[PDB]
Design an enzyme around this catalytic site. Structure first.
Site, short mmCIF file in Angstrom:
data_model
loop_
_atom_site.label_atom_id
_atom_site.label_comp_id
_atom_site.label_asym_id
_atom_site.label_seq_id
_atom_site.Cartn_x
_atom_site.Cartn_y
_atom_site.Cartn_z
N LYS A 125 2.09 5.92 -7.32
CA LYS A 125 1.04 6.67 -7.99
C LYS A 125 1.36 8.16 -8.00
CE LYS A 125 -2.82 5.42 -5.93
NZ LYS A 125 -4.28 5.66 -5.78
N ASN A 126 1.86 8.68 -6.87
CA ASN A 126 2.19 10.10 -6.80
C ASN A 126 3.40 10.44 -7.66
OD1 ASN A 126 0.09 10.31 -4.98
ND2 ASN A 126 1.41 10.33 -3.17
N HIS A 154 0.83 -1.20 0.00
CA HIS A 154 0.00 0.00 0.00
C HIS A 154 0.86 1.25 0.00
CE1 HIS A 154 -2.51 3.24 1.53
NE2 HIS A 154 -3.58 2.54 1.19
N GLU A 157 0.96 3.77 -3.25
CA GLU A 157 0.53 5.16 -3.14
C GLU A 157 1.66 6.11 -3.51
OE1 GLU A 157 -2.39 6.16 -2.87
OE2 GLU A 157 -3.34 4.23 -2.42
N1 LIG Z 1 6.07 12.81 -5.63
C1 LIG Z 1 5.29 13.90 -5.65
N2 LIG Z 1 5.54 14.94 -6.49
C2 LIG Z 1 4.76 16.03 -6.51
N3 LIG Z 1 3.69 16.19 -5.71
C3 LIG Z 1 3.33 15.23 -4.82
C4 LIG Z 1 4.13 14.00 -4.75
N4 LIG Z 1 3.57 13.22 -3.81
C5 LIG Z 1 2.49 13.89 -3.32
N5 LIG Z 1 2.35 15.08 -3.93
C6 LIG Z 1 1.29 16.07 -3.64
O1 LIG Z 1 0.59 15.71 -2.45
C7 LIG Z 1 -0.82 15.69 -2.69
C8 LIG Z 1 -1.50 14.59 -1.89
O2 LIG Z 1 -1.14 13.31 -2.39
P1 LIG Z 1 -1.82 12.00 -1.76
O3 LIG Z 1 -1.94 12.24 -0.27
O4 LIG Z 1 -1.08 10.79 -2.27
O5 LIG Z 1 -3.30 11.97 -2.38
P2 LIG Z 1 -3.60 12.34 -3.92
O6 LIG Z 1 -2.56 11.56 -4.68
O7 LIG Z 1 -5.01 11.85 -4.13
O8 LIG Z 1 -3.44 13.84 -4.01
C9 LIG Z 1 -1.00 15.52 -4.20
O9 LIG Z 1 -2.15 16.21 -4.67
C10 LIG Z 1 0.29 16.06 -4.78
O10 LIG Z 1 0.12 17.39 -5.28
MG LIG Z 2 -1.81 9.93 -3.82
#
Ligand SMILES: Nc1ncnc2c1ncn2[C@@H]1O[C@H](COP(=O)(O)OP(=O)(O)O)[C@@H](O)[C@H]1O
Ligand SMILES: [Mg+2]
Ligand SMILES: CNc1cccc2c1NC(=O)C2(C)C
Lengths: 337, 349
Positions: B227-228, B220, B224
């Site tokens: 995906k980011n 998980h 996650e």
């Molecule tokens: N590796 C990354 N690079 C750029 N922005 C990121 C990254 N990881 C997270 N973020 C930022 O953090 C926010 C929250 O991410 P997350 O908590 O995984 O939920 P979601 O992916 O649905 O937004 C995202 O909207 C993104 O803008």
């Molecule tokens: Mg996310």
């Protein structure tokens, strides 16, 4: 507990922005500093008085108190002078020089008192936390008073700088110099030093030189300490080159330093910023103008150090400790462990 | 609050190590523990649910979750009279855990639905959701451990003891989680960054990296984070002729198993870094899903911290981001991080 200390301690320090400090480039800076410096000295002096009695009674802390008190009294004397008195302005600069010389050994002196107290006395967990809290604030306070005094001295006493501020600080140049400075000490001690692999990315202005308004000496101090640790870890663990990337974003100037010096367990990463003063003070320099300094290590491989600096001078505002009810409450101060 | 909730909320949760959870698979002992520990944990979080703002508790979603936890608490307290030697009680207890597990299956999406109605900046809501979801992580962990070891029909993975893999192939989980994210990234962008994986076994040089861990939790977290990283990489380089890989380094040290995920997806300002770990916070809109719910980072960090690990993000705004997972390399130090309802928690609200 002198009267002037109690008086000026009731004022809250007034944080300045990098932008304001550039405006120094004499009557106004004089009126401000003759007020602000006693306030900042008085605030930390009162905070010294709530430390453990055995620490305050160390010759080292007594020295620091005496210096800060004398400097406060030297500055308060100028409250009887007119900002139009051109000689009082001149004398004020000479007094800042005297104060700067008097405070030259504050950092190691205070450190000596802390080490003497810790080595000789029992420190409960609350007190140990309060000491790190106090030292962060004490050293930030010094960083701030030294900043303000040097700005006035340098302007009203490098020609390309406005006081100690470089309005177009060549960040990469500072990184390269700080690396070389560490490289020299590393060779002297280890007879061999890692090389520098430097990458720069200007997201704010692609393919253009990276410049921000900053104090190059402060940046040099941070990088020098991080490079010393990266080089000491690389040579002792092993030479792999220390990788540095300098990035300018919309709001932030980011510098990441990476080595392969075997890293440190996460359990000990926090101890690096406990008071062994270079790293915690380096982080204070980063946070002084609303930046930050983080370490994340991969135990068994290496360590990354990332410096965050504000890319805008208007947002580069002094992060100053204040001895108010909140601070005093933090000293008095959900999940299973 | 029913009397059972008031009573069992007075007890503090008893955190277990991953070694102890493994040792359950070395039945009456787990039954004796869970029939007490699960009501205590349900009761602790049930008390905090009442502290929430009236507009949020009164949501049908939160009221449902509260009603489910209450019923599951009552189901479990029914066993306090039974003897651990009563084999029928042990069998019925498994059936009850399966019933509670199924009843709780939709807690997270229900709770998330509740937050959507109440609606990132609510510090008390972030505090509660960290504790609520950590509480659920822990109760699901404990119940599934008993179910997957002692039930007749629910065997889990044959190589796991319950949900714990004593020889978790970290790199294999990384590759599996990366593929799962790649499949989703391809659907949303018709392209996905490649994986540039490096592994360093500082504890056992050149040896495969295994630790005792819950692969589902690790999967998980990595899924996650991937995906980011993929979303940020593709969108930041959408005007570039290619995609920079996502660089992953898996490091096993003496005390820590560290996973660093590095992308060149443009990064984020330090100003909003803390906001990223807030529930619901997402630069993408809320779905009805690659991104948008804003739970990836906070939930992933809960999983990392659940066993005394951690999850940190360090971003170079204008370049990319480093996501770093810290896990304890020793199962004995992998101790549950559990919220407790007490004066401290109440004062925090
Ligand atoms: N590796 C990354 N690079 C750029 N922005 C990121 C990254 N990881 C997270 N973020 C930022 O953090 C926010 C929250 O991410 P997350 O908590 O995984 O939920 P979601 O992916 O649905 O937004 C995202 O909207 C993104 O803008
Ligand atoms: Mg996310
Ligand atoms: C940029 N590298 C480092 C920066 C600070 C401290 C360290 C580094 N590397 C190390 O091993 C220790 C000494 C933990």
């Amino acid at each position: 507990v002198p009267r002037e200390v109690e008086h000026f301690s009731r004022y809250s320090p007034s944080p300045l922005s990098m932008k304001q400090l550039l405006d120094f480039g004499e009557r106004t800076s004089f009126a401000f500093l003759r007020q602000e410096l006693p306030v900042r000295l008085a605030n930390i002096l009162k905070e010294i008085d709530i430390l453990p009695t055995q620490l305050v009674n160390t010759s080292s802390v007594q020295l620091v108190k005496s210096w800060y008190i004398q400097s406060l009294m030297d500055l308060v004397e100028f409250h009887e002078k007119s900002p139009d008195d051109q000689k009082a302005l001149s004398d004020f600069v000479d007094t800042l020089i005297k104060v700067r010389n008097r405070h030259h050994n504050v950092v190691p002196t205070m450190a000596q008192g802390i080490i003497e107290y810790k080595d000789a006395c029992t420190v409960d967990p609350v007190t140990n936390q309060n000491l790190q809290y106090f030292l962060d604030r004490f050293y930030m306070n010094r960083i701030s008073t030294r900043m303000l005094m040097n700005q006035h001295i340098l302007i009203f006493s490098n020609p390309s700088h406005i006081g100690s501020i470089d309005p177009n600080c060549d960040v990469v140049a500072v990184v390269q110099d700080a690396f070389e400075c560490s490289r020299m000490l590393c060779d002297q001690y280890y007879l061999s030093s890692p090389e520098l692999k430097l990458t720069q990315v200007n997201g704010k202005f692609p393919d253009q030189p990276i410049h921000i308004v900053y104090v190059p000496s402060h940046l040099h101090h941070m990088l020098f300490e991080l490079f010393k640790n990266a080089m000491r870890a690389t040579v002792e663990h092993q030479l792999t080159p220390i990788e540095v990337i300098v990035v300018l974003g919309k709001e932030d100037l980011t510098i990441k330093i990476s080595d392969r010096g075997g890293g440190v367990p996460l359990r000990i990463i926090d101890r690096l910023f406990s008071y062994g003063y270079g790293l915690p003070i380096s982080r204070l320099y980063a946070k002084y103008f609303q930046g930050d300094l983080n370490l994340y290590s991969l135990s068994g491989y290496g360590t990354d150090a990332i410096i965050y600096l504000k890319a805008l001078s208007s947002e580069s505002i002094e992060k100053l400790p204040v001895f108010n009810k909140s601070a005093f409450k933090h000293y008095q101060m959900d999940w299973c462990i």
